[PDB]
């Protein structure tokens, strides 16, 4: 269950290895818009938080 938009669910992600292979295997993806990055070049950068 997802919370509604007035009280939106927030989560901080701790340190790990982040395979974005998953997250691609979900849906026909009506919107997939990165802004500061590009999805074709997502598996090489290493964000802090």
């Amino acid at each position: 269950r997802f919370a509604s938009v007035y009280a939106w669910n927030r989560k901080r992600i701790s340190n790990c290895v982040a395979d974005y292979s998953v997250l691609y295997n979900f849906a026909p993806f009506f919107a997939f818009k990165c802004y500061g990055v590009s999805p074709t070049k997502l598996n090489d950068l290493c964000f802090t938080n």
């Binding site: 026909p28 993806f29 997939f32 999805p39």
Partner: protein
């Protein structure tokens, strides 16, 4: 002059554009940014 032609779904016509990302512009028809052509797209019901 290169005439390319196909059929796509109704809510997909916005994807036929230079510099886009979607399930039809990933690896079916990628339009480059050096695009000097013209995209014509019309409704094809009853024939198709």
């Amino acid at each position: 002059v290169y005439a390319d032609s196909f059929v796509i779904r109704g809510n997909e016509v916005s994807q036929i554009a230079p510099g886009q990302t979607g399930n039809i512009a990933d690896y079916n028809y990628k339009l480059p940014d050096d695009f000097t052509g013209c995209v014509i797209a019309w409704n094809s019901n009853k024939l198709d």
